[PDB]
Nucleic acid binder design. Sequence first.
RNA 1: AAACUUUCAACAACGGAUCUCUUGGUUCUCGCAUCGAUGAAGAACGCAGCGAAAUGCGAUACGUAAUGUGAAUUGCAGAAUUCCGUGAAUCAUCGAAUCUUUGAACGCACAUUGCGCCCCUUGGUAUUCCAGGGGGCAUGCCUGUUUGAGCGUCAUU
RNA 2: CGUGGAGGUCAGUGACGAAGCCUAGACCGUAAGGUCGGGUCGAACGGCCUCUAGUGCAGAUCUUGGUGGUAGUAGCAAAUAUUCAAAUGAGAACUUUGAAGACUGAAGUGGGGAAAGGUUCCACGUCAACAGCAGUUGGACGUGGGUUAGUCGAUCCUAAGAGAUGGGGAAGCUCCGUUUCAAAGGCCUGAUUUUAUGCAGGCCACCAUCGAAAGGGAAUCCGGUUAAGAUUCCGGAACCUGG
RNA 3: AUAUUGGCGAGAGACCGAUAGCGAACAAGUACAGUGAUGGAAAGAUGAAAAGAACUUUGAAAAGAGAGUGAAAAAGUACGUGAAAUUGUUGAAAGGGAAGGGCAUUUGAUCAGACA
Lengths: 85, 126, 50, 49, 119, 71, 207
Amino acid sequence: GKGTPSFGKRHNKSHTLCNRCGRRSFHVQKKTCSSCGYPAAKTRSYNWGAKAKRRHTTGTGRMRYLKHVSRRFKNGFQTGSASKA
Amino acid sequence: AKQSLDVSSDRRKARKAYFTAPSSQRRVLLSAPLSKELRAQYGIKALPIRRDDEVLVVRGSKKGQEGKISSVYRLKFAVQVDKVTKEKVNGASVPINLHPSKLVITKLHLDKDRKALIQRKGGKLE
Amino acid sequence: AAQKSFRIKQKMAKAKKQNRPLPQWIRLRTNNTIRYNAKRRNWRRTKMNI
Amino acid sequence: RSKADRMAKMERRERNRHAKQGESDRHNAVSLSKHLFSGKRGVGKTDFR
Amino acid sequence: AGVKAYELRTKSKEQLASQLVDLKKELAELKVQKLSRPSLPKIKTVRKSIACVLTVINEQQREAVRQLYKGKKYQPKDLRAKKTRALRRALTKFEASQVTEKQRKKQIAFPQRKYAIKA
Amino acid sequence: AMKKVEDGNILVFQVSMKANKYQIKKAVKELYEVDVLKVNTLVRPNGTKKAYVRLTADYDALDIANRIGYI
Amino acid sequence: SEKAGHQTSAESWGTGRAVARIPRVGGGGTGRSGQGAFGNMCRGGRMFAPTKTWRKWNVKVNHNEKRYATASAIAATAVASLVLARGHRVEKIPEIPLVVSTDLESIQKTKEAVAALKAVGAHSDLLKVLKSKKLRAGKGKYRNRRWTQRRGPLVVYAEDNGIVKALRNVPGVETANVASLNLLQLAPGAHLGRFVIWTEAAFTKLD
RNA sequence: AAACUUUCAACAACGGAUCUCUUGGUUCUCGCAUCGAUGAAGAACGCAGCGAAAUGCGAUACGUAAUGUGAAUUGCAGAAUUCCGUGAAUCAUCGAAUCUUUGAACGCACAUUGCGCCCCUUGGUAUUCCAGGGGGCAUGCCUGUUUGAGCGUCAUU
RNA sequence: CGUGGAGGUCAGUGACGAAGCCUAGACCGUAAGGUCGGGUCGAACGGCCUCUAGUGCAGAUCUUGGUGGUAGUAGCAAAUAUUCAAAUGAGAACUUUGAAGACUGAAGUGGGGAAAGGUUCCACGUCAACAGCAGUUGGACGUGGGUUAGUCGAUCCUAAGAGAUGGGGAAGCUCCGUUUCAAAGGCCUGAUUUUAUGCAGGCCACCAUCGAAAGGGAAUCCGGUUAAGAUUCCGGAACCUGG
RNA sequence: AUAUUGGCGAGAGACCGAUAGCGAACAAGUACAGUGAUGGAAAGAUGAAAAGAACUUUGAAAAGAGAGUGAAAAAGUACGUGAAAUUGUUGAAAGGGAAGGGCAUUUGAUCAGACA
């Protein structure tokens, strides 16, 4: 009566998709996300969860802008354009 | 021997920088030596292979056969000379890959830039 | 759910377009290690979890 | 087309030996389940009929 | 093939915008033919021709605004330098070169001399 | 879709997702110079917006469909 | 690595009959779940006694004893029955130690220096090398140590004037100053008597 | 006696050990200092002539521009002028651009592709109504400006 | 004695077959083990003096992987039940049409929906796997097609309640609080002929926002049509809100 | 001058060599499980070159037998080497409620050495 027949009553979602992390960890009644700390201003992480940091450090995604920084440093942050030598 | 720090003598560095070499650096790797006919003519030992050159095979099963290069196939580090093929059993024909360190050039194809390369490296051309 | 929202429906359109086998000409390329589609979903077996 | 149709049937074969009912059956078999073996059954209420 | 960039740089502004619309009529008509043909590889070249015109129209307006604000303080933010965040918030070459008026009198009278110990 | 051209006097187009009924009613009138009675839209299951455009009774759907070319 | 094997949250199930006490990986559904972890005998576990960096790598040796062994390494080069016992095809040269004039130091090219090494009598000992290059025996091939070979004569000079660059290429040959005199060169593999060619200005400096 | 059970060999199976490989790791040393309100890291969806993914990219979408190298790309189809040249390509470099919807996230809101307002402008006989196109509207604090408040308070009629 | 590497030596062995693996074939050592012949094989590997360790397995209800005996065995026994002929097919107890026979019996095995699933709905091609027998059929496989709204819903309002700002705590991430010890905010006409808005000058004192696809709620019905959609499309006839 | 398991660029090792080494040599923080915080694998090797078996005949087809490519199909997309458990056929041998072992010989199979 607590096992397989009352698993059949389970059809109301606790969590929905979060906007910041896209994780399906957004608790509806608490209005907050368990995984990525939304809507608070800081991304939730802890040093007890070390594996949770490796899943979401920098470099894990696209790095749309940081992949072009050290190339700009190696030239020394130049402007203008080429001269056609 | 090695007397610098910027060069590497590591097996695992040198193979990975060969197999994942970009397309423009594969031009230099697929160089072919000139014949002693042309070596007296220009005074230069080796040149990167181009499409329209004429060549002679000197090592392998196809030794002694010659032709014009159809297309340089840098993705496989190989070059497909026409009239050097395996005819299949079903009538079709398949070109045979060759590596250009074993080829020998007897006729060059010259653009403006091929003249500018030979004048650069110490040539004599005419 | 027959009264769905757009955010859920946009993810159903992505799971439909990924629901296909692998094309035949990728078999023939040079240094192909790809043999089948290893990320294939089916509605029958594995629920996509929203 | 008949060459790549053959390369489908040369590489489907490993999934049919495991009787994959598609190419999308990747239900993973657990080695050992906890509720079968992790207990000491004594006098009183137990975990199954 | 398609258009060349350097040929567009000689044309006027009214002729660039007319060049753009004439490509977009072609790109609309090749997508009608795409369902009739099994393959139509030409639609790549007319598509990059749309990108080549839009770069030139953008470049000619961004060079026209720099002359509108040349010789003037506070030019807009996307025309300024990008360099990075914490280098923009820094002391300039003027301000870090500044020193108080007392130290200016010190460094003239007593600078680090040049000398040597042999004889 | 060709069955709806002849009886319905209706063209069928595919429309970018951001557009609405006022822009389909405006752009069809501009590009083909053919007035629009009503526009109906929906979102396909594959993720793009379809639009049913019914031209007025003056303008015929077959003769415009030859000028664009699909038939 | 210090954290190898411990990237797991395993825990013992307890004491059933049909299971051991080695702490099982929790969770379910992935096939990893329910396997042993954190043991040395488990698959994918850590090893016994993870080897740390602060093992004693270098050995301190007494300085007076280190000077002692370099002295006994030199005095075996004269004896010349030990030199044949190590290798070094020196059966044709008349006297050992060989002393060559100081003009050996001032040679600039490699082609001239080999002709100097042939005419003193080190011909076959040069040719003992270059007949003897082989491959390494095991897994030392793809650890940047692929080829192995024998050693050759050792040339001692007083003052560098181009002999160290001339003999830098030719295989087997190792040149050495008098002030240095490496023990790792005079007795390779703790065998006395490497065949040494001396120069004259180096030999009178040895007092 | 056959069958059957057991033992060993031969060849054939099941199974993936051994031996040999290696674009991966691991530790050690040296050189350098560079993320973000000029919208970062992260996320969502989209992009190819034929792609599901990895890698790349943002309606200019496996890339546009500038420069260097100077004939390819390749599984196929396609392009021959694009080959003594302002010029090939999934090349190399990178100093100019685009940068969807989000995110500290910033008009308010968000389980919604919800709901306002201001300016410039075009169409609908319209400053007011409806729609399209372009541009704006968060909070804390500092310096400056402008308009103010208080019998806090001074002079002056 | 044997194992993985290291320094040295045998100018050691090797595509004329190195290492491995099999071998009721041979030889040596009391033994650890060593050597040789044969078969298989396809690229590197040994002897000897020394150095170094992640150096020797039958067990730990050992770890991972693989295979047996039991065994062609237990079993596939709830829900009243199947039968004949033809077509299709290499093949039919199971597919398809027809002829019979039965059941659910309007608190159904019928016709629509809410949570929930996500293309399963429909057509075409087709049977290696899957439907614990079968298979030509399928909720399987391969390729395509399909969801149309001024009126149906969401959006809007408030319920129990969530929650910023002004503030007050807190070392701090953050806590209390909902009109509070706060200077909290915009309408309505004019009068105009710089025409745009001066001033006329009154009134208001309330003051975030989120919270129901079942409560509250502006307004649509009938007949046709699709392989698959309709209070949405077509034909016909109405009503509502902002202008 | 000092610190540094992170970011970027380098150079090396008496280290490990696919149950090892990071969890990951491979579309790995991926497939998959959980409401959730989080948990989290398996998976490298045809050949020098696809020259990936045209064609013939049996079969409804998968495939089989030939032919052919190749140095090698005792390398055929289940692909380098393919060990043991376990199994099939053939050949030998034994056998009344076990089997296996020790000393000693018979019979049967098999085999090296030496006699110039």
